[PDB]
Amino acid sequence: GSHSMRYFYTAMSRPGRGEPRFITVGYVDDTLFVRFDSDATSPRKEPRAPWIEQEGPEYWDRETQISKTNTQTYRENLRTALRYYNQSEAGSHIIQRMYGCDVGPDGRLLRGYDQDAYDGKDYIALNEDLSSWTAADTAAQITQRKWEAARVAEQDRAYLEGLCVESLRRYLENGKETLQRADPPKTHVTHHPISDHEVTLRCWALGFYPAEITLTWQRDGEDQTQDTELVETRPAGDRTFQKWAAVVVPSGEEQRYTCHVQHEGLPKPLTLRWEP
Amino acid sequence: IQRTPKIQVYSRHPAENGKSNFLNCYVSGFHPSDIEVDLLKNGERIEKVEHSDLSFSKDWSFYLLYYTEFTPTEKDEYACRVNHVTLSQPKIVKWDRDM
Amino acid sequence: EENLLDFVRF
Numbered sequence: 001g002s003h004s005m006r007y008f009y010t011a012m013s014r015p016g017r018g019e020p021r022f023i024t025v026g027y028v029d030d031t032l033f034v035r036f037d038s039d040a041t042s043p044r045k046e047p048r049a050p051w052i053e054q055e056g057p058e059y060w061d062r063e064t065q066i067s068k069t070n071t072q073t074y075r076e077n078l079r080t081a082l083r084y085y086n087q088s089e090a091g092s093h094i095i096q097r098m099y100g101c102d103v104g105p106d107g108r109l110l111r112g113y114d115q116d117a118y119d120g121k122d123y124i125a126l127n128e129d130l131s132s133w134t135a136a137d138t139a140a141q142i143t144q145r146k147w148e149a150a151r152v153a154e155q156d157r158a159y160l161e162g163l164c165v166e167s168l169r170r171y172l173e174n175g176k177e178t179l180q181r182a183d184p185p186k187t188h189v190t191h192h193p194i195s196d197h198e199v200t201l202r203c204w205a206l207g208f209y210p211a212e213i214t215l216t217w218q219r220d221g222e223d224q225t226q227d228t229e230l231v232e233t234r235p236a237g238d239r240t241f242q243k244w245a246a247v248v249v250p251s252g253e254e255q256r257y258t259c260h261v262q263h264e265g266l267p268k269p270l271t272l273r274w275e276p
Numbered sequence: 277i278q279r280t281p282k283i284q285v286y287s288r289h290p291a292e293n294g295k296s297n298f299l300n301c302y303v304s305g306f307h308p309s310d311i312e313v314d315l316l317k318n319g320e321r322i323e324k325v326e327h328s329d330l331s332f333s334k335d336w337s338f339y340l341l342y343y344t345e346f347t348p349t350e351k352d353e354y355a356c357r358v359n360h361v362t363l364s365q366p367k368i369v370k371w372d373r374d375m
Numbered sequence: 376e377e378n379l380l381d382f383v384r385f
Contacts, residue, residue, distance in 0.1 A: 007377055008331055008332060010309060010330055010332065010338075012308070012309055012310075023329065023330050024377075025329050025330070025331050026377075027331075032328075032329065032331075035329045037329070048329075059376075062379070063376070063377060066377045066378075066379050067377075069381055073381075073383065073384065076384060076385075077384065077385040080384065080385040081385060084385070092308065092310075094307075094308055094309065095385075096332060096336055098332075098334075099378065114378075116385075117336045119278070119307075119308075120278055120279065120307035120308070120336045120337070121336075122336075142385075143385045146384065146385075147383070150382075150383075152380070152383055155380045156378065156380070159378040159380065163376050163378070164376075164378070166376075167376035190374065192374060202374070206290075231284060231375075232282060232284070232302075232304060232305075234284050234286065234300070234302045234304075235300070235302065235328075235341050236288045236289075236300075237288050237298050237300055237341065237343050238288060242286070244375075
């Protein structure tokens with residue numbers, strides 16, 4: 001149904017170790033499709049999914065040039081950020097950017113994004129209106145003033161409503177075998193005695209795509225949030241993801257617990273129990 | 277200074293002794309991005325481990341997957357060793373096939 | 376495809 005495209009920039013200064021490293025990765029949903037790294041032997045935008053390989057040489061030259069220009073732009077941004085925060089040239093600092101668009105089943109824009117962070121803290125963000133900015137502090141307010149003067153938001157809006165959604169629609173069609181296939185979780189509950197009267201029940205979800213999933217334990221039909229150990233969803237390395245949720249239960253009470261699984265590849269949410 | 281990595285060590289497929297598989301170490305939630313990650317076999321560093329391209333989450337924290345092919349056995353112990361500015365000493369996490 | 380808006384500076 002719904003889909004997203006996102007580009008992520010990371011620009012990291014490293015005084016004494018050359019110019020700041022600039023990396024760009026692009027995703028459609030939870031699928032990496034392009035990368036650029038300024039430390040690469042001959043830096044270029046490179047394909048990372050089969051369906052982007054059919055874009056012609058002109059695409060790759062244009063995309064590479066955008067990245068080459070942005071490595072310079074973001075190196076300048078790093079220097080500017082030092083001034084704005086009255087910082088020494090001694091330390092390593094990081095600017096990040098994430099921008100892109102979400103589209104619905106009909107491929108219309110649901111919303112656009114363009115936001116930056118400095119040293120892991122929000123710096124500036126294009127508002128959902130795609131016409132105004134939210135600056136995090138008085139430093140970012142200087143940037144806001146410059147972007148207001150140069151009508152950057154209008155230019156971002158044109159991109160988000162145009163090329164962003166248009167290119168994503170093309171990617172979704174070219175990659176329809178994978179990007180438009182949801183792989184449901186393979187689920188099971190394992191049982192591990194901790195001590196005489198304590199047992200760990202672990203609910204597994206494996207082999208699923210996209211990454212979004214909900215795993216919850218209930219005891220007598222009531223959610224056990226504060227008693228549930230929930231690991232972060234993690235990549236398998238084969239495009240798919242894994243997750244588990246665990247509860248510690250009194251021996252003999254295993255059947256009072258039920259694991260609940262929600263995923264877009266499942267027609268209805270699943271209920272699992274430990275199966276002796 | 278500022279965010280310490282979470283660390284998960286796990287396999288791509290369910291582990292079955294003598295079956296070729298992939299050993300993964302997923303580091304996430306960290307900032308800044310510099311991180312040192314080794315996969316260990318019986319305490320010794322595995323050569324030529326690969327990793328994903330630096331990406332980050334909605335909260336700006338970074339994540340990376342380090343991975344290598346391996347054939348698990350009953351005796352061979354595997355782990356992931358991570359160092360970050362936030363850690364005074366490298367953190368070692370042992371592979372547990374039930375996690 | 377990326378936004379090719381060039382001259383945006385902090």
